Amino acid sequence: VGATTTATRLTGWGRTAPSVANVLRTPDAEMIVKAVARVAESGGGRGAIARGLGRSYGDNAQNGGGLVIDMTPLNTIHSIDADTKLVDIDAGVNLDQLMKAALPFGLWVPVLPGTRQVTVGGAIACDIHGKNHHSAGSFGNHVRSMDLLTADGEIRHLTPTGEDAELFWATVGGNGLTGIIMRATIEMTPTSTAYFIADGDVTASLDETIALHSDGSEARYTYSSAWFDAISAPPKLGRAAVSRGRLATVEQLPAKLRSEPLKFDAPQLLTLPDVFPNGLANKYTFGPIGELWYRKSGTYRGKVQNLTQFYHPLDMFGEWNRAGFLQYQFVIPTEAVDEFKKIIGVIQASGHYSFLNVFKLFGPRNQAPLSFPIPGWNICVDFPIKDGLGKFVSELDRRVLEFGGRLYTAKDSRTTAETFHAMYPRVDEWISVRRKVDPLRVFASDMARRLELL
Ligand SMILES: Cc1cc2nc3c(=O)[nH]c(=O)nc-3n(C[C@H](O)[C@H](O)[C@H](O)COP(=O)(O)OP(=O)(O)OC[C@H]3O[C@@H](n4cnc5c(N)ncnc54)[C@H](O)[C@@H]3O)c2cc1C
Ligand SMILES: COc1ccc(CNc2nc3cc(C(F)(F)F)ccc3nc2C(=O)O)cc1F
């Protein structure tokens, strides 16, 4: 329970670009206020940045030669209310913790990323998105208030629509550069079960994948995402396994599950690598029977699924996934469909092979100037680090930029300031807010300096 300050070598989830910071770790809020006051009174040096669970791949949660404040000990859930749907929680609370605590109230975390190991602070600061972006927006859309420790040492109560709305919306997606989010109130989504009813589809090509997302069917599902093929030559290029669904109601559950509709079942002992150590391939896998088999297994209607089944389907693959990788995620505006296809073609012909590829059509954006999601074609790819990759991804940056798209700060450790600023045309507007709230650069990070956000 005691406060500690420790020189620590930090990296994001990508394990790249390490830098040494003094890491403060304390469950005492007043100690965090005092540390920020100390940096502020210092009138120099390299400032401070908050750090959550370190799930961002890049360098936004580290500060070489400065202070890093580990927020994970501030993890109190203050209250949950089923009538108002509000949760009041410290910024260090993580989404898995929150999901579990809130389920007995018939409340659902309104935006969940592909991993549950992210803090509320990290969720706000990266304005995270999920499988339901097109129906629910991003994390920032659901924050009703937050308490922000600013450079002047004061704790400001921010609301999306109040007098401090400008600062609220600069903090959403602000990558911790407006101050330290101490605490927040989130509006949860009501639910009668912890289950999904899901429809699966399998497409044969990129053209089919795009048509499926463009035919109006997306409006029938609150949740929608896809795995796609980024390695095969066209026309197989861009074929996808698509998973779409909505939260189930109690009466849609089979009789055996209806007695505990809000139950989160425990992740089981055995994963697929444990049961099939020699892999899943047989003599049929890559020919026409394999094709039919995968088509059939991935095509279904009204299937009842728990959270892991529906939302974390890679979990069953255990140690096989991510077997020195560069995570690259971008969105291209909806209208730019040919441009989007062109970029997918570029990736396939590049000689860089990504096996893990998520595809999603984002919905409307929010008013946060630095928010990543815009309506359009969102893709994540995972490239093994090898010769030529750095220069190739710089070419990808140019294409993404030229086609009106952007990269996501939570995934980036290598784009340039020039590129990033052009991708985010409201960056100057955001920088102006940051300069008002932090004239002395009390808040600073490796990303802030790299991307000239400092
Ligand atoms: C396997 C995996 C799957 C993922 N899937 C998704 C996805 O589906 N959608 C998506 O949007 N993202 C996804 N991400 C990225 C992840 O959601 C974000 O990186 C998120 O910000 C990580 O939260 P964290 O608590 O680990 O924050 P960190 O990585 O520690 O910090 C990220 C940023 O938040 C800031 N920050 C943290 N706490 C505070 C605070 N209290 N006050 C102010 N600023 C703070 C930091 O300064 C930093 O700028 C995924 C990441 C992984 C590893
Ligand atoms: C245990 O192994 C894994 C478990 C889950 C995943 C899914 N990961 C993601 N899933 C993502 C899903 C989305 C979206 F919401 F768009 F579907 C957007 C971004 C995503 N980013 C990521 C990521 O790894 O950074 C990947 C894994 F390698």
The answer to whether 70 touches 51, Cβ cutoff 8 Å, is: yes
DSSP class of residue 205 equals: S
**Those residues with Cβ within 8 angstroms of residue 394's Cβ, 6 or more apart along the chain or in another chain:** none
Measured distance CA(277)–CA(256) in Å, rounded: 33
331 strand-pairing partners = 378, 406
Strands (E), 150-291: 155-158, 180-187, 189-190, 196-202, 223-228, 240-247
Question: How far is CA 336 from each of CA 342, 375, 404, rounded to the nearest angstrom?
Answer: 10, 11, 8
Contact 361, 373 (CB under 8 A): no
The residues, any chain, with a CB within 8 Å of residue 32's CB and separated by 6 or more, are: 24, 26, 69, 74, 149, 180, 182
Residue where the block lists tokens 């260090």: 92
The sign of the dihedral angle between the CA atoms of 347, 351, 352, 357 is: positive
Q: How far is CA 99 from CA 78, 186, 284, 357, in A?
A: 14, 12, 41, 26
d(CA 179, CA 164): 14
- Going by alpha carbons, the residue nearest to atom 17 of ligand 2 is 131
| Total length of the chain | 454
In one letter, which amino acid is 211?
A
The answer to whether 445 and 177 are in contact (CB under 8 A) is: yes
Q: What residues flank ligand 1, with Cβ below 6 Å?
A: 13, 49-56, 60-61, 71, 91, 113-115, 118-119, 121-122, 125-126, 128-130, 175-176, 180-181, 410
Q: Which of 364, 245, 372, 307 is nearest to 112 (CA)?
A: 307
- The span from the CA of 343 to the CA of 350, in Å, is 10
Q: How far apart are CA 354 and CA 380, in angstroms?
A: 9
- The answer for 127, left when phi > 0, alpha when psi is -120 to 50, beta otherwise, is left
Ligand 2 atom nearest to 225, measured from its CA: 17
Collect all residues with Cβ–Cβ distance below 8 Å to 207 and sequence separation of at least 6: 235, 238, 341
What residues contact residue 433 under an 8 Å CB cut-off, 6+ apart?
166, 167, 170, 178, 369
Nearest to 33 by CA among 145, 121, 140, 156: 156
> What number of CA atoms fall less than 13 Å from residue 238's CA on the CB side?
25
- Name which residue sits closest to atom 24 of ligand 2, judged by CA: 114
For CA atoms 386, 388, 391, 393, give the dihedral sign. Answer: negative
Other CB atoms within 10 Å distance of the CB of residue 292? 11
Atom index in ligand 1 nearest the CA of residue 92 equals 41
**Domains held by the chain: number:** 1
Q: Which of 119, 223, 430 to mutate to test the pocket of ligand 1 (most atoms within 8 A of CB)?
A: 119
Amino acid at 298: G
Distance CA 132, CA 114 (A): 11
Domain that holds residue 160: 1-454
Kindly state the tokens that stand for 373: 């999601």
361 Cβ partners below 8 Å, 6+ apart? Answer: 134, 213, 218, 224, 334, 376, 377, 378
Q: How far is CA 4 from CA 104, 223, 252, 436, in A?
A: 35, 42, 51, 31
Find, among 144, 146, 158, the residue nearest to 186 by Cα.
Answer: 144
Report whether residue 129 contacts ligand 2, using a CB cutoff of 6 Å. yes
- Beta strands in 159-296, from DSSP E residues, in sequence order: 180-187, 189-190, 196-202, 223-228, 240-247
Q: Is the CB of 156 under 6 A from ligand 2?
A: no
From its phi and psi, is residue 388 left (phi > 0), alpha (psi between -120 and 50) or beta? left
- Structural tokens at position 277: 């150590």
Among the listed residues 70, 9, 77, 8, the one whose alpha carbon sits nearest the alpha carbon of residue 35: 70
